Each structure stands twice: as C-alpha cells, then as structure tokens.
Coordinates of N, CA and C in Angstrom, one line a residue:
Chain A
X107 N 45.0 25.4 93.0 CA 45.7 23.7 92.9 C 46.4 24.4 91.2
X108 N 47.4 24.7 90.9 CA 47.5 25.5 89.5 C 48.5 23.8 88.6
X109 N 48.2 23.6 88.0 CA 49.0 22.4 87.1 C 50.2 23.1 86.8
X110 N 51.4 22.6 87.1 CA 52.8 23.2 86.8 C 53.0 22.5 85.5
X111 N 54.2 23.7 84.7 CA 54.3 23.2 83.5 C 54.1 21.9 82.7
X112 N 55.7 21.1 83.5 CA 55.7 20.0 82.9 C 54.9 18.8 82.9
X113 N 53.8 18.9 83.9 CA 52.9 18.1 84.1 C 51.9 18.2 83.0
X114 N 51.9 19.6 82.7 CA 51.2 19.9 81.8 C 51.2 19.4 80.2
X115 N 52.6 19.8 80.5 CA 52.8 19.7 79.3 C 53.1 17.5 78.9
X116 N 53.3 16.6 79.9 CA 54.1 15.1 80.2 C 52.3 14.6 79.6
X117 N 50.9 15.2 80.3 CA 50.1 14.5 79.8 C 49.3 14.9 78.9
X118 N 49.3 16.4 78.5 CA 49.1 16.4 76.6 C 49.7 15.8 75.1
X119 N 51.1 15.8 76.1 CA 52.0 15.2 74.5 C 51.2 13.9 74.2
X120 N 51.3 14.2 72.6 CA 51.0 12.7 71.3 C 50.9 11.5 72.0
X121 N 50.0 10.8 72.4 CA 49.7 9.3 73.0 C 48.1 9.1 73.0
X122 N 48.5 7.3 73.3 CA 47.0 6.5 73.0 C 45.9 7.5 74.5
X123 N 44.9 7.8 74.4 CA 43.8 8.4 75.3 C 42.6 8.0 75.1
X124 N 41.7 7.2 75.6 CA 40.7 6.9 76.2 C 39.8 8.3 75.2
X125 N 38.9 7.7 73.9 CA 38.3 8.6 73.1 C 36.4 8.5 72.7
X126 N 35.9 8.8 72.8 CA 34.4 8.7 73.2 C 33.8 8.6 71.6
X127 N 33.7 8.2 70.9 CA 34.3 7.9 69.7 C 32.6 7.2 69.0
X128 N 31.4 8.0 68.3 CA 30.6 7.9 67.1 C 31.0 6.7 66.1
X129 N 29.4 5.7 67.0 CA 29.3 4.0 66.3 C 29.5 4.9 64.9
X130 N 28.5 5.4 64.1 CA 28.2 5.9 62.9 C 29.7 6.8 62.2
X131 N 30.5 7.2 63.0 CA 31.8 7.7 62.6 C 32.5 6.7 61.8
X132 N 32.5 5.1 62.4 CA 33.4 4.1 62.5 C 32.4 3.3 61.6
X133 N 31.3 3.4 61.5 CA 30.3 2.4 60.2 C 29.8 3.4 59.6
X134 N 30.2 4.3 58.4 CA 29.2 5.1 57.4 C 28.0 4.3 56.9
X135 N 28.6 3.8 56.7 CA 28.1 2.6 55.7 C 26.8 1.9 56.2
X136 N 26.5 1.8 57.5 CA 25.8 1.4 58.4 C 24.5 2.2 57.6
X137 N 22.9 2.2 57.3 CA 21.8 2.8 56.7 C 20.9 1.6 57.2
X138 N 20.5 0.5 57.5 CA 19.6 0.1 58.3 C 19.0 0.4 59.8
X139 N 20.5 -0.3 60.6 CA 20.1 -0.5 62.2 C 20.3 0.8 63.0
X140 N 19.8 0.8 63.8 CA 20.3 1.9 64.8 C 21.1 1.3 66.9
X141 N 21.7 2.0 66.6 CA 23.2 1.1 67.4 C 23.0 1.6 69.2
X142 N 22.9 1.4 69.7 CA 22.2 1.8 71.9 C 24.0 0.8 72.1
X143 N 25.0 1.8 72.7 CA 24.8 3.0 73.1 C 25.3 3.6 71.5
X144 N 24.9 4.4 71.4 CA 25.7 5.3 70.2 C 26.9 6.2 70.4
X145 N 27.9 6.1 70.5 CA 29.3 5.8 71.4 C 29.8 5.3 72.0
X146 N 30.6 4.5 72.0 CA 31.6 3.4 72.8 C 33.4 4.2 72.6
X147 N 34.1 3.6 74.2 CA 35.2 4.2 74.7 C 36.8 3.9 73.1
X148 N 37.4 3.9 72.9 CA 38.3 3.6 71.9 C 39.5 4.3 73.1
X149 N 40.3 3.6 73.1 CA 41.9 4.3 72.8 C 42.5 4.9 71.8
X150 N 42.6 6.0 71.0 CA 42.7 6.8 70.2 C 43.4 7.5 70.5
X151 N 44.7 7.7 69.9 CA 46.3 8.7 69.7 C 45.4 10.3 69.6
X152 N 45.3 11.0 70.6 CA 45.4 12.7 71.0 C 46.5 12.8 70.9
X153 N 46.1 14.7 71.7 CA 47.3 15.7 72.3 C 48.8 16.4 71.0
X154 N 49.3 17.2 71.5 CA 50.3 18.0 71.0 C 51.5 17.1 70.6
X155 N 52.2 17.8 69.6 CA 53.4 18.1 69.4 C 54.4 18.6 69.3
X156 N 55.8 18.8 69.5 CA 56.6 19.7 69.7 C 57.2 20.8 68.7
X157 N 56.7 20.6 67.5 CA 57.0 21.2 66.6 C 55.2 21.1 66.1
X158 N 54.5 23.1 65.5 CA 53.7 22.9 64.4 C 53.6 22.1 62.9
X159 N 54.8 21.4 62.5 CA 54.9 20.9 61.4 C 54.5 19.3 61.6
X160 N 54.8 18.8 62.7 CA 55.0 17.1 63.1 C 53.2 17.2 63.7
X161 N 52.8 15.9 63.4 CA 51.0 15.3 63.9 C 51.5 14.2 64.8
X162 N 50.1 13.7 65.5 CA 49.8 12.6 66.3 C 48.9 11.9 65.9
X163 N 49.9 11.2 64.8 CA 49.6 9.6 64.7 C 49.5 8.4 65.0
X164 N 48.9 7.6 65.0 CA 49.5 5.7 65.4 C 50.5 5.4 64.7
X165 N 51.1 4.4 65.2 CA 52.1 3.6 64.3 C 51.9 1.8 64.7
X166 N 51.4 1.7 66.2 CA 50.5 0.3 66.6 C 49.0 0.4 66.9
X167 N 48.2 -0.5 65.8 CA 47.0 -0.4 65.8 C 46.6 -2.6 66.3
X168 N 45.4 -2.1 67.2 CA 44.9 -3.4 67.0 C 43.1 -3.1 67.0
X169 N 42.2 -4.4 67.1 CA 41.0 -4.3 67.0 C 40.3 -4.7 68.0
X170 N 39.5 -4.2 68.9 CA 38.3 -4.3 70.0 C 37.0 -4.8 69.8
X171 N 36.5 -6.0 70.5 CA 35.6 -6.3 70.2 C 34.3 -5.5 71.7
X172 N 33.3 -5.4 70.6 CA 32.6 -5.0 72.5 C 30.9 -5.3 71.9
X173 N 29.9 -5.6 72.9 CA 28.3 -5.8 72.6 C 27.8 -4.4 72.7
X174 N 27.0 -4.6 71.6 CA 26.6 -3.4 71.1 C 25.0 -3.9 70.7
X175 N 23.9 -2.6 71.3 CA 22.9 -3.4 70.7 C 22.3 -3.0 69.2
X176 N 22.1 -3.7 68.9 CA 21.7 -3.2 66.7 C 20.3 -3.7 67.0
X177 N 19.7 -2.2 66.8 CA 18.1 -2.2 66.5 C 18.1 -2.1 65.1
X178 N 16.3 -2.4 64.5 CA 16.1 -2.5 63.3 C 14.7 -1.7 63.7
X179 N 14.7 -0.6 63.8 CA 13.3 0.5 64.6 C 11.7 -0.5 63.8
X180 N 11.4 -0.5 65.0 CA 9.8 -0.7 65.0 C 9.6 -2.1 64.6
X181 N 10.7 -2.7 64.4 CA 11.0 -4.0 64.0 C 11.5 -5.2 64.9
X182 N 13.0 -4.9 65.6 CA 13.2 -6.1 66.6 C 14.3 -5.1 67.1
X183 N 15.2 -6.1 67.8 CA 16.4 -5.7 68.6 C 17.5 -7.0 69.3
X184 N 18.8 -6.5 68.8 CA 19.5 -8.2 69.1 C 20.8 -7.4 69.8
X185 N 21.7 -8.0 70.4 CA 22.9 -7.4 70.9 C 24.1 -8.5 70.0
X186 N 24.2 -7.7 69.6 CA 25.9 -8.2 69.0 C 27.5 -7.7 68.7
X187 N 27.9 -8.5 68.5 CA 29.3 -8.0 68.7 C 30.3 -7.2 67.6
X188 N 30.5 -5.9 67.5 CA 30.9 -5.0 66.6 C 32.4 -5.3 67.1
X189 N 33.0 -5.1 65.9 CA 35.1 -4.1 65.7 C 35.1 -3.3 66.2
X190 N 36.0 -2.4 66.5 CA 36.5 -0.9 66.3 C 38.4 -0.1 66.0
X191 N 38.6 -0.2 65.6 CA 40.1 0.4 65.4 C 40.7 0.7 67.0
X192 N 41.5 0.7 67.1 CA 42.2 1.1 68.3 C 43.7 1.6 68.3
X193 N 44.2 2.7 68.9 CA 45.6 2.8 68.7 C 46.4 2.3 70.3
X194 N 47.7 1.7 69.7 CA 48.2 1.0 70.6 C 50.0 2.0 71.3
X195 N 50.4 2.1 69.9 CA 51.4 3.0 70.1 C 51.1 4.9 69.5
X196 N 51.6 6.1 69.4 CA 51.4 7.4 68.3 C 52.9 7.7 69.1
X197 N 53.2 8.9 67.7 CA 54.2 9.7 66.9 C 54.0 10.5 66.8
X198 N 54.7 11.7 67.4 CA 55.0 12.8 66.2 C 55.6 12.3 65.0
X199 N 55.2 12.7 63.4 CA 55.6 12.5 62.7 C 55.3 13.8 61.3
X200 N 56.3 14.0 60.9 CA 55.9 15.5 59.6 C 54.4 15.1 58.9
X201 N 53.7 16.4 58.2 CA 52.5 15.6 58.1 C 52.3 15.2 56.4
Chain B
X722 N 39.7 -9.5 75.9 CA 38.8 -10.5 75.4 C 37.7 -9.5 75.2
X723 N 36.6 -9.7 74.9 CA 34.8 -9.2 74.2 C 34.6 -8.2 75.6
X724 N 33.7 -6.8 75.2 CA 33.8 -5.4 76.2 C 32.1 -6.1 76.2
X725 N 31.6 -6.9 77.6 CA 30.5 -6.7 77.9 C 29.9 -5.3 77.7
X726 N 28.4 -5.8 77.5 CA 27.0 -4.8 77.2 C 27.0 -4.0 77.9
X727 N 26.9 -3.6 79.2 CA 27.1 -3.0 80.3 C 28.6 -1.9 80.5
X728 N 29.7 -2.6 79.9 CA 30.8 -2.0 80.2 C 30.3 -0.6 79.7
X729 N 30.5 -1.1 78.0 CA 30.6 -0.3 76.8 C 29.9 0.8 77.2
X730 N 28.2 0.5 77.7 CA 27.2 1.7 78.1 C 27.7 2.8 78.9
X731 N 27.8 1.7 80.0 CA 28.7 2.5 81.7 C 29.7 3.2 81.6
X732 N 30.4 2.8 80.8 CA 32.0 3.9 80.4 C 31.9 4.9 78.6
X733 N 30.2 4.6 78.3 CA 29.7 5.6 77.2 C 29.5 6.6 77.6
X734 N 28.0 5.9 78.4 CA 27.2 7.4 78.8 C 27.8 8.7 79.4
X735 N 27.1 10.0 79.5 CA 27.5 10.7 79.1 C 27.8 11.2 80.6
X736 N 29.5 12.0 80.4 CA 30.2 12.1 81.8 C 31.6 13.0 81.4
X737 N 31.9 13.5 82.9 CA 33.1 14.1 82.4 C 34.3 13.1 82.3
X738 N 35.1 13.6 81.0 CA 36.3 12.6 80.7 C 37.4 13.9 80.3
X739 N 38.3 13.2 80.7 CA 40.3 14.1 80.6 C 40.0 14.0 78.3
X740 N 40.2 15.4 78.5 CA 39.5 15.7 76.7 C 41.3 16.9 76.5
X741 N 41.5 16.9 75.3 CA 42.5 17.3 74.7 C 42.6 18.3 73.9
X742 N 42.4 19.7 74.1 CA 42.0 20.9 74.1 C 43.2 21.7 73.6
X743 N 42.7 21.4 72.1 CA 44.3 22.9 71.2 C 43.7 24.2 72.3
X744 N 44.9 24.9 72.6 CA 45.2 26.3 73.4 C 44.7 27.2 72.7
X745 N 43.7 27.2 70.9 CA 43.7 28.1 70.3 C 42.2 27.6 69.6
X746 N 41.7 27.0 70.1 CA 40.3 26.8 70.5 C 39.5 27.8 71.7
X747 N 40.3 27.3 73.0 CA 40.3 28.2 74.0 C 40.4 30.1 73.8
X748 N 40.7 30.3 72.8 CA 41.7 31.6 73.0 C 42.3 32.0 71.9
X749 N 41.2 31.7 70.7 CA 41.5 32.0 69.3 C 41.9 33.4 69.0
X750 N 41.9 34.7 70.2 CA 41.7 35.4 69.5 C 43.4 35.5 69.4
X751 N 44.6 34.9 69.9 CA 45.9 34.4 70.8 C 46.7 34.2 70.3
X752 N 46.5 34.3 68.5 CA 47.5 33.5 67.0 C 48.9 34.3 67.1
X753 N 48.8 35.6 67.7 CA 50.3 36.6 67.2 C 51.1 35.7 68.3
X754 N 50.4 34.9 69.5 CA 51.9 33.9 70.2 C 51.9 32.6 69.7
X755 N 52.4 31.9 70.0 CA 52.8 30.7 70.2 C 53.5 29.7 71.6
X756 N 51.9 28.9 71.8 CA 51.9 28.2 73.3 C 52.5 26.9 73.6
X757 N 53.2 26.7 74.5 CA 53.5 25.2 74.6 C 53.4 25.1 75.6
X758 N 52.7 23.7 75.8 CA 52.0 22.7 75.1 C 50.9 23.5 73.9
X759 N 50.7 22.9 73.2 CA 49.5 23.8 72.1 C 48.1 23.3 72.5
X760 N 48.3 22.2 73.3 CA 47.4 21.6 73.9 C 47.5 21.6 75.5
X761 N 45.9 20.9 75.7 CA 45.9 20.9 77.5 C 44.5 20.1 78.0
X762 N 45.3 19.0 78.7 CA 44.5 17.8 79.7 C 43.1 18.7 80.5
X763 N 41.5 18.5 79.7 CA 40.7 19.3 80.3 C 39.5 18.1 80.8
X764 N 39.2 17.9 81.9 CA 37.7 17.1 82.3 C 37.0 18.0 81.5
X765 N 36.0 17.2 80.5 CA 34.8 17.7 78.8 C 33.5 16.9 79.8
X766 N 33.0 17.7 79.1 CA 31.2 16.8 79.0 C 31.3 15.6 77.6
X767 N 31.3 14.2 77.8 CA 31.3 14.1 76.2 C 30.7 12.6 76.3
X768 N 30.9 11.8 75.3 CA 29.3 10.5 75.2 C 28.4 10.7 74.8
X769 N 27.7 9.3 75.4 CA 25.7 9.5 74.4 C 25.0 9.6 75.7
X770 N 23.8 9.4 75.6 CA 22.7 9.5 75.6 C 22.0 9.0 75.3
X771 N 20.2 8.5 75.9 CA 19.7 7.0 75.8 C 18.6 7.7 74.9
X772 N 18.5 8.6 74.5 CA 17.1 9.3 73.6 C 17.7 10.2 72.9
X773 N 17.0 10.2 71.7 CA 17.2 11.2 70.5 C 17.6 12.9 70.6
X774 N 16.5 12.8 71.4 CA 15.8 14.4 72.4 C 16.8 14.5 73.0
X775 N 17.6 13.9 73.7 CA 18.4 14.1 74.6 C 20.2 14.7 74.2
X776 N 20.6 15.0 74.9 CA 22.3 15.9 74.9 C 22.8 16.0 75.6
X777 N 24.1 15.3 75.5 CA 25.1 15.7 77.1 C 25.6 16.6 77.0
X778 N 25.2 17.8 78.3 CA 25.5 19.3 78.5 C 25.8 19.0 79.9
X779 N 27.3 20.1 80.3 CA 27.4 20.3 81.6 C 26.1 21.2 82.6
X780 N 25.8 20.7 83.9 CA 25.4 21.4 84.7 C 26.1 21.9 86.0
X781 N 27.1 22.0 86.0 CA 28.2 21.9 87.3 C 29.9 22.6 86.0
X782 N 30.5 23.9 86.2 CA 31.7 23.8 85.6 C 32.1 24.8 86.6
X783 N 33.9 24.6 86.3 CA 34.4 25.4 86.7 C 35.9 25.2 86.8
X784 N 37.1 26.6 87.0 CA 37.9 27.2 86.4 C 39.9 26.4 86.9
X785 N 40.4 25.9 86.0 CA 41.7 25.3 86.6 C 42.6 26.1 85.5
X786 N 43.7 26.6 87.1 CA 44.9 26.9 86.1 C 45.4 26.5 86.2
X787 N 46.5 26.6 84.5 CA 47.5 25.7 83.9 C 49.1 26.6 84.2
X788 N 50.3 26.2 84.0 CA 51.6 27.2 83.6 C 51.6 27.0 82.5
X789 N 51.4 27.7 80.9 CA 51.8 27.3 80.0 C 52.8 28.6 79.7
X790 N 53.7 28.1 79.0 CA 54.6 28.8 78.0 C 54.4 29.6 76.9
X791 N 54.1 31.0 76.9 CA 54.0 31.5 75.7 C 54.8 32.2 75.7
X792 N 55.2 32.2 73.5 CA 56.6 33.0 72.7 C 55.8 33.4 72.0
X793 N 56.4 34.7 72.5 CA 56.2 36.2 71.1 C 57.1 35.7 70.3
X794 N 57.0 36.0 68.9 CA 58.2 35.2 68.0 C 58.7 36.6 68.0
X795 N 60.0 35.8 68.0 CA 61.7 36.2 67.7 C 62.0 37.0 68.8
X796 N 61.0 37.3 69.6 CA 60.8 38.1 70.4 C 61.7 37.5 72.3
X797 N 60.6 36.7 72.4 CA 60.7 36.1 73.9 C 60.2 35.3 74.5
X798 N 60.5 34.3 75.6 CA 59.3 32.9 75.8 C 59.0 33.6 77.3
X799 N 57.4 33.1 77.9 CA 57.4 33.5 79.4 C 55.8 31.9 79.6
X800 N 56.4 31.8 80.7 CA 55.9 30.7 81.7 C 54.4 31.0 82.9
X801 N 53.2 31.5 82.2 CA 52.7 32.3 83.1 C 51.0 31.1 83.6
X802 N 50.7 31.6 83.8 CA 49.2 31.2 84.3 C 48.2 31.2 83.2
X803 N 47.2 30.4 83.1 CA 46.3 30.4 81.9 C 44.8 29.9 82.7
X804 N 43.8 30.2 82.0 CA 43.1 29.7 83.5 C 41.6 28.7 82.0
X805 N 41.5 27.9 82.4 CA 40.6 26.4 81.0 C 39.1 26.4 81.8
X806 N 38.6 27.2 81.3 CA 37.1 25.8 81.7 C 36.9 24.9 81.7
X807 N 36.2 23.8 82.8 CA 36.4 22.3 82.8 C 35.0 22.4 83.4
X808 N 34.1 20.9 83.0 CA 33.0 20.6 83.6 C 32.7 19.3 84.2
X809 N 32.4 19.8 85.7 CA 32.7 19.0 87.2 C 31.4 18.1 87.0
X810 N 30.5 18.3 86.5 CA 28.9 17.4 86.3 C 28.7 17.0 84.8
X811 N 27.7 16.2 84.7 CA 27.8 16.5 83.4 C 25.5 15.1 83.7
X812 N 24.8 15.8 82.5 CA 23.5 15.3 82.8 C 23.4 15.4 80.6
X813 N 22.1 13.8 80.6 CA 21.8 14.1 79.1 C 20.5 15.1 79.4
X814 N 20.1 16.3 78.7 CA 19.2 17.3 79.1 C 18.3 16.8 77.8
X815 N 17.4 17.5 77.7 CA 16.4 18.0 76.2 C 17.0 18.6 75.4
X816 N 17.2 18.9 74.1 CA 17.9 19.4 73.0 C 17.6 20.9 73.2
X817 N 18.3 21.8 73.2 CA 18.3 23.0 73.8 C 19.4 23.9 72.2
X818 N 18.9 24.5 71.3 CA 20.0 24.4 70.3 C 19.3 25.9 69.3

C-alpha cells in the first residue's frame, strides 16, 4: 500500500499532534525530584507549512493536569498533580 | 479532567507513535530538490523506560512508500514514490551507544 500524495499532505500539515515530551524540558528548574514516568503525552503543534518562509506555531493553548510519581532519591515517593501546556490550535505564520 | 497516573504511564511508555519527520532529515543529500510536503507521518519509537540504564529502541522495522512532489527549482515538478523507515515494534533495552 503506497500512501497517496493528498493524505500524506493532509496528515503532515501543521496541526496539534500527540507528542511524548520529557518532563525536564517542561520543568528545567527542578533539581531535587525524579519523575516517573519521565515523559508525558501532550497535544503539541507539529508538521509542515506550504512555504519554507512559514512556521507552525500554536494560536490557542490550554493547560492539562496529570498524576506524576514525584521521587526524592533514597528518601521517599509521592504521586502528585503536575500541569503542562497543550496546543488546541496551530497556524502557519512567517518566521 | 485530571489524567490518572496509570493512563499517563501506559500512553507514555516506549512504543511506536506517529511522528512528523522532515524529509531532509531522512534524505539530507537531496537538498538540491524541494519536497512538498516537506515533512511526512512515520510510526517511530518514542516515550520513556522504567530504568535509567534502558533506552527505547526499535526491534522490528519496515519501509513505507509515499507519493511526494519533488521540485527541481526553476525546471519542474514530479510526484514520485519515496521510501521511509518505520518502527513496527519497540522495547526498553539496555543502553548501547
């Protein structure tokens, strides 16, 4: 089965897609705690635009809260709520 | 609603996930041509593993064929087949790098 040009185009065009995101790229300032899982499923703008001068950026955003196991090594564990940015809408705009 | 711990874990664990890949990452020597679209949807290994000494790697791979428009600048365009590597199955395996 060869993927036809048009649905390659439609499926790849700039839009929100579930992205597995490292928690440390979302909370770089965390120094004490270890997180499990280390990564989370977040709806994020991805894909391509119809000109190389355009770029795929979010226009709408909403926050999402997830249960994450927060570990202080050799000290203890607790499951807590953490908030992450998600993209509801995306647009191809100049760089 | 708040996503349950177990749902986060199952959805984020090392597995094949649809990934938007730039054609120029898969064919870096072909930048004399312009490809529309410039990125394609590929099933690739992604997500996280339950121990520091583990990485998420493919264990089964296959090729997918896609119709892509190839532009030779100021000459013409051609829609032709182009093969891309897909990951069919993934596992957390001891690091090897």
